[PDB]
Write a protein that binds this DNA or RNA. Structure first.
Ligand SMILES: [Mg+2]
Ligand SMILES: [Mg+2]
Ligand SMILES: [Mg+2]
Ligand SMILES: [Mg+2]
Ligand SMILES: [Mg+2]
Ligand SMILES: [Mg+2]
Ligand SMILES: [Mg+2]
Ligand SMILES: [Mg+2]
Ligand SMILES: [Mg+2]
Ligand SMILES: [Mg+2]
Ligand SMILES: [Mg+2]
Ligand SMILES: [Mg+2]
Ligand SMILES: [Mg+2]
Ligand SMILES: [Mg+2]
Ligand SMILES: [Mg+2]
Ligand SMILES: [Mg+2]
Ligand SMILES: [Mg+2]
Ligand SMILES: [Mg+2]
Ligand SMILES: [Mg+2]
Ligand SMILES: [Mg+2]
Ligand SMILES: [Mg+2]
Ligand SMILES: [Mg+2]
Ligand SMILES: [Mg+2]
Ligand SMILES: [Mg+2]
Ligand SMILES: [Mg+2]
Ligand SMILES: [Mg+2]
Ligand SMILES: [Mg+2]
Ligand SMILES: [Mg+2]
Ligand SMILES: [Mg+2]
Ligand SMILES: [Mg+2]
Ligand SMILES: [Mg+2]
Ligand SMILES: [Mg+2]
Ligand SMILES: [Mg+2]
Ligand SMILES: [Mg+2]
Ligand SMILES: [Mg+2]
Ligand SMILES: [Mg+2]
Ligand SMILES: [Mg+2]
Ligand SMILES: [Mg+2]
Ligand SMILES: [Mg+2]
Ligand SMILES: [Mg+2]
Ligand SMILES: [Mg+2]
Ligand SMILES: [Mg+2]
Ligand SMILES: [Mg+2]
Ligand SMILES: [Mg+2]
Ligand SMILES: [Mg+2]
Ligand SMILES: [Mg+2]
Ligand SMILES: [Zn+2]
Lengths: 159, 205, 56, 104
RNA sequence: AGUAGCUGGUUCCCUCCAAAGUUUCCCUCAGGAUAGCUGGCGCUCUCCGCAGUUUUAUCCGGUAAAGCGAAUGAUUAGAGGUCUUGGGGCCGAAACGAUCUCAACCUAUUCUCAAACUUUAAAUGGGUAAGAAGCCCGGCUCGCUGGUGUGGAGCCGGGCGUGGAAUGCGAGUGCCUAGUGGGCCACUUUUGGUAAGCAGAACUGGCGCUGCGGGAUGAACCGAACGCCGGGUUAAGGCGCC
RNA sequence: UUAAUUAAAACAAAGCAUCGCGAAGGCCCGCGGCGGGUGUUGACGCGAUGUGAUUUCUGCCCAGUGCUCUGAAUGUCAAAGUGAAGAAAUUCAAUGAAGCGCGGGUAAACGGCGGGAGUAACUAUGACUCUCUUAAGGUAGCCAAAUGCCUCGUCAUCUAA
RNA sequence: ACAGUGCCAGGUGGGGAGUUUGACUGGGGCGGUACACCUGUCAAACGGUAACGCAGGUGUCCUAAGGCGAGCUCAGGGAGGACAGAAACCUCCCGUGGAGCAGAAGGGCAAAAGCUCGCUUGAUCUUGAUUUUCAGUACGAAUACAGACCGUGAAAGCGGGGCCUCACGAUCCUUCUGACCUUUUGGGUUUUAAGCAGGAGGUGUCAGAAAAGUUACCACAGGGAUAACUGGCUUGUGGCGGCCAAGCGUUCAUAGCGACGUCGCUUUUUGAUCCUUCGAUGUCGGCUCUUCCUAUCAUUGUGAAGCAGAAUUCACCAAGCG
RNA sequence: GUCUCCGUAGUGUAGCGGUUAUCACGUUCGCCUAACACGCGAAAGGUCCUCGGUUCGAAACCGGGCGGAAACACCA
RNA sequence: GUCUACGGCCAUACCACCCUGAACGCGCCCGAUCUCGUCUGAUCUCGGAAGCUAAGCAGGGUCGGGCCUGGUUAGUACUUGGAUGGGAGACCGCCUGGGAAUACCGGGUGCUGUAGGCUU
């Protein structure tokens, strides 16, 4: 069997990328984390304090508590047939603001602007996204050039 | 002394080199990979034939040593001891184990090193011979005779590259004239249009 | 005698019979585990909310 | 392991850091009139033989060292037990280490 | 009527639902407890929520491949330098004087490699988001923070419904609970082993619990899953005769 | 002698050799006693072992384990008794039966009884020597023996084999 | 006045009594520990994932090797300098870590996490929350805080052990520490004793019995979950047979052989496995008797020889008869 | 095969993490003797089996090889 | 055009060598009384202002090494899902989708925030 060691199997997971070792850039500590923020957890081997456990590496959760150095994150974890909402205390070196919602918050403002504007013009504008539709009919101009004929090439043993 | 080569024909295990974890591996049967006139310049031997594996299998170091002898002896007989240069292109790095029985049985069955093999892919060159153009038939026969020391299926193929270089023979002569290639013993160095211009001054002076 | 050691075979089939349900979500989440110093003030803030009742 | 014979640590009676004398803790001798020893004597009397287990399969080769601290404050003289990790060799107030010295 | 975690047996019908051989602990390994898997009783709503699916964004990863004229490790061949060292020589009065010659060294190349190597780096995959529990305004509380009526959190009032990707589907919740806790097989991946109808894993699907058409025959293959019937048509397989 | 698969080389035996005991005793029975057997006995006896007629012999070892003998000279050592402290419970101390430790004896008590190297004027052996070594280092005998793996040992005899 | 007897106490006491004499495990035993832990790999790019799988480590060590601050920069190399040389010490230069950080390995680390100094005891006192294993229990270890006391620094800060991943232990009992503490039963004082909270004494089979053999005189309940025959899969080993052709054969590869290699076949060897049989399939050998195979020793008919004859060798059809 | 153990002058052997690598025999030199032996006074001589590692320092401590010697291999 | 102080991202910014630097800066530089620290006022600390861009630093250059980014490698290698496909096997082809990395070839060589200077 395997060991129950806390950091087993993190040889590559927690190591630093190639030629990106050494000092931690200080903008890592200047990020502002509020209650309700979505953050992606990514353990960093340079700082050994407040390390998330390996199972939380690559997961995204919500901030519920902010201390001087860490935050409390409610992150889902699947254990067999159930998913538990787990609360982990992670130092802010091992997290980053998630962009997963920014595309949504961009759309809301665009939605809220368009909804307001269209209303005062008495017009209807699409607000819901749609899946990419089938391409519509179009013309392809030859420009008096016959398409180049293609043929399969003969086999060649380039051994 | 050793098991028949059918017992280790196929690449069933991950590569198992001789390392600090696999210790006590006996020496491989094949220790020489180049014989003949190794020192011939690039231009003396333009022709190059290959023995190319048509199978994905394991070739034992004993078969590589035997084939090398079989191919080399013919070349000496038909082209002279200085009319060719042979290069075995496979090195037996994968170690094969043995679980030696006489009795525990299958308890603690992990085996001890027994030998070494080369893992060869489909289309991978096994050994190469370069010589003069007129010796084309003698290369093919030398490699045809060496196919009988190996398991599986091999193909003899006369390369379109010049000698043991990576450059086509139909344009190697011009590339040397234009100084894109510089003879460097058995092979050629490639000179790009890059780097310090003092190199260009040296070549062109 | 010897027997089988371990398997998770048939386990995802069992987990999905009653569904792998996500945790239940309520609009009000408990303040368990938040900073004690922060929580002490939030209680003082709630306690004196009635002071500004008339102004509101 | 080498531990100083004094340390300035927290005293619970004084409620502040104070100098303490450090010694090793030694198990006291057993009373004959502890309820557990009295109950044992009664259960062990008469016939029947041994009535409680006798532990044989010892495995540990060391003990946890317990420091006995005593507040030097004349009026307080409180005490406290402070256990440290396992060690085969323990001494109090041994010679301190030195660096850059010739090892004769 | 000794005990038996062990062998044997355990008595009418129909109807509905329907498993497990796995997790952890146990002087635990032919057994229990425990979670999972089942059943029953319902109840709270409904006629928004959810999903073994994709889409769109957004993160996570170090396997496959590749690389070794990139680090670590292993490894073949020549070539050019060379006094910075050595062995052969070799002319000597002899020295770093001369003369070569073969090695070690250095410099560009070159063949071949890695489960316990790696700069690169997939496919499949794992999280998260895709709104009303939202957004935007005005105010109030604070013993927290503080150059600042600053920050942060909470609370009160008000305004906004094009319910803000596709598709499908009614959901949520609580008690009590049996049997099981010997499995085995196949595609693919995969460890040991010469290999095994061998031993051991991952994923999914099966057999076990399951008939039926086909593979002559057959637990698992291929097709297809079953109330009692008539007609039609098929699948996989077939159409000399049986 | 194993009734009913073993008749024997097993058991017994005479012979031999040890051991305890002089009776308030040895050995043994018995829940019990002024109990009982040996014992209607008394060392040429009774009790307990080993070996196994005769013949010839029975080597060395008391380190081990046993058995045994000496003991205030004397470490440990229970209860009771003695002394001190205390309000007492209690605590402490001094003292110190056997037995263990300590020292002798004992193998017809259980048992035990080596290794390396060199060396004689051909070769081989090696009487001889050096060395490590235990409580002795297997003596007289005897042997491929019912005991020797290698092993169907080697030589001779017995056979055509 | 002892024998002796009664009752206590110490010794002896397999004469006798009762009981125990682990588990995993390619049968069991012997051997190992895969039984509690940790690193890399397996492992199939989230996590998880097995074997008596692979390579290793663990039961410790540290008054500093803990804490803070400052100052420095390491391995190696090049070139110089009395004795001095391969290697002593001094100087300059290059040096991305090729060193060091207690230990196994992996990660991490350069005005530092290393080296050297100065000061120190955050290795202290205290309540909850969380993470890891997980049943979302315990322990262990670890993470954010909160309250005190402190250290350090000019200060921001940092520190409640060791840069991170291991380094450890329930109930009952005993022992120590703590309070102007509670109880000590009709009340009061005082010893004692018991409570309450926190440490320690230990269970390594590490969620924690107190434990030696032998049975061929053996017993019962079971087991084909499991060994000793046959049979079955496999064929390493055994046996038999090809292919290439370096050589041997005076000459001459192939009359006859044949290295280095390599491809098969067989189930008259031994293994490996454990599918059937443990409410029983009689376990070696011989004797006797029938039958079948061919991988042919003889015989019939043949081809080839390094076949003069004779004898012999190789090959073919071939198992009728021996 | 599993388990345990051992390699030190020419021979047999000690070595209680810092030794001028112990002891005896042996060998070489000088006395003694007419000469040998015995005896007396002196001298030399260890690839600490080999590779690697921790250690300020390894013959010693820890791993891997190379030789070697014991103990087991049972139930059928 | 540009610098100084403090920065963010952290080589398009690094490394090597060469050329040029107006003004203000930053420096080198000159001393050791004081503060402070050294075997040594070299460093550190302090007091200065004779000299110089020599150096650091800034800008530029090199068929420069590196680094960054494209192309090729290549719809290749690998890969999800499918077949009563092939083949004795080893393995391979096809169907439905995804889709790399060297060598080799090209291009580039810091951007920028706050505050304060210089530059008719
Ligand atoms: Mg394998
Ligand atoms: Mg099971
Ligand atoms: Mg009693
Ligand atoms: Mg009964
Ligand atoms: Mg049982
Ligand atoms: Mg237990
Ligand atoms: Mg059963
Ligand atoms: Mg991996
Ligand atoms: Mg690969
Ligand atoms: Mg299987
Ligand atoms: Mg069943
Ligand atoms: Mg079913
Ligand atoms: Mg079915
Ligand atoms: Mg059929
Ligand atoms: Mg019909
Ligand atoms: Mg038919
Ligand atoms: Mg009888
Ligand atoms: Mg009879
Ligand atoms: Mg006797
Ligand atoms: Mg004696
Ligand atoms: Mg004897
Ligand atoms: Mg004798
Ligand atoms: Mg007894
Ligand atoms: Mg008994
Ligand atoms: Mg067992
Ligand atoms: Mg995976
Ligand atoms: Mg520092
Ligand atoms: Mg604090
Ligand atoms: Mg430290
Ligand atoms: Mg209990
Ligand atoms: Mg009273
Ligand atoms: Mg018997
Ligand atoms: Mg027996
Ligand atoms: Mg059998
Ligand atoms: Mg064979
Ligand atoms: Mg010949
Ligand atoms: Mg079976
Ligand atoms: Mg089986
Ligand atoms: Mg039967
Ligand atoms: Mg029968
Ligand atoms: Mg025939
Ligand atoms: Mg100027
Ligand atoms: Mg100066
Ligand atoms: Mg200049
Ligand atoms: Mg360039
Ligand atoms: Mg710039
Ligand atoms: Zn005090």
């Amino acid at each position: 069997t395997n060991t129950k060691g806390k950091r087993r199997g993190t040889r590559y997971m927690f190591s630093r990328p190639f030629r990106k070792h050494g000092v931690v850039p200080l903008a890592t500590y200047m990020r502002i984390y509020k209650k309700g923020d979505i953050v992606d957890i990514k353990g960093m081997g340079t700082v050994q304090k407040g390390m998330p456990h390996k199972c939380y590496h690559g997961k995204t959760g919500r901030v519920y508590n902010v201390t001087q150095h860490a935050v409390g994150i409610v992150v889902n974890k699947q254990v067999k047939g159930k998913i538990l909402a787990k609360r982990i205390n992670v130092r802010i070196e091992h997290i980053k603001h998630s962009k997963s919602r920014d595309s949504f918050l961009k759309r809301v403002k665009e939605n809220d602007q368009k909804k307001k504007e269209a209303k005062e013009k008495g017009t209807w504008v699409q607000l819901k996204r749609q899946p990419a539709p089938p391409r519509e009919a179009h013309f392809v101009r030859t420009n008096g050039k016959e398409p180049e004929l293609l043929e399969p090439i003969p086999y060649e043993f380039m051994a | 002394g050793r098991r028949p080569a059918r017992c280790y024909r196929y690449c069933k295990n991950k590569p198992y080199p001789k390392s600090r974890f696999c210790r006590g591996v006996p020496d491989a049967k094949i220790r020489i990979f180049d014989l003949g006139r190794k020192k011939a310049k690039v231009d003396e031997f333009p022709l190059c034939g290959h023995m190319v594996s048509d199978e994905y299998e394991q070739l034992s170091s004993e078969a590589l040593e035997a084939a090398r002898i079989c191919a080399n002896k013919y070349m000496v007989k038909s082209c002279g001891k200085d009319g060719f240069h042979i290069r075995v292109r496979l090195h037996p790095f994968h170690v094969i184990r043995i679980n030696k029985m006489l009795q525990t049985g299958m308890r603690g069955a992990f085996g001890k090193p027994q030998g070494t093999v080369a893992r060869v892919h489909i289309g991978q060159v096994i050994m190469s011979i370069r010589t003069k153009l007129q010796n084309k038939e003698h290369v093919v026969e030398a490699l045809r005779r060496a196919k009988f020391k190996f398991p599986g299926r091999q193909k003899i193929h006369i390369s379109k590259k010049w000698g043991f270089t990576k450059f086509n023979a139909d344009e190697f002569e011009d590339m040397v004239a234009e100084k894109r290639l510089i003879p460097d013993g058995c092979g050629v160095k490639y000179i790009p249009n890059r780097g310090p211009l003092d190199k260009w001054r040296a070549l062109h002076s | 005698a010897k027997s089988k050691n371990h398997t998770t075979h048939n386990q995802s089939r069992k987990w999905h019979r009653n569904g792998i349900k996500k945790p239940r979500s309520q609009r009000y989440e408990s303040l368990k585990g938040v900073d004690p110093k922060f929580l002490r003030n939030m209680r003082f803030a709630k306690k004196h909310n009635k002071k500004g009742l008339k102004k509101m | 392991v080498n531990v100083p014979k004094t340390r300035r640590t927290f005293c619970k009676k004084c409620g502040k850091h104070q100098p303490h004398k450090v010694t090793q803790y030694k198990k006291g001798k057993d009373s004959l009139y502890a309820q557990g020893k009295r109950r044992y004597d009664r259960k062990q009397s008469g016939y029947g033989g041994q009535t409680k287990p006798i532990f044989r399969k010892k495995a540990k080769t060391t003990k946890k060292i317990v420091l006995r601290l005593e507040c030097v404050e004349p009026n307080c003289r409180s005490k406290r037990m402070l256990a440290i990790k396992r060690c085969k060799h323990f001494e109090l107030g041994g010679d301190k280490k030195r660096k850059g010295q010739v090892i004769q």
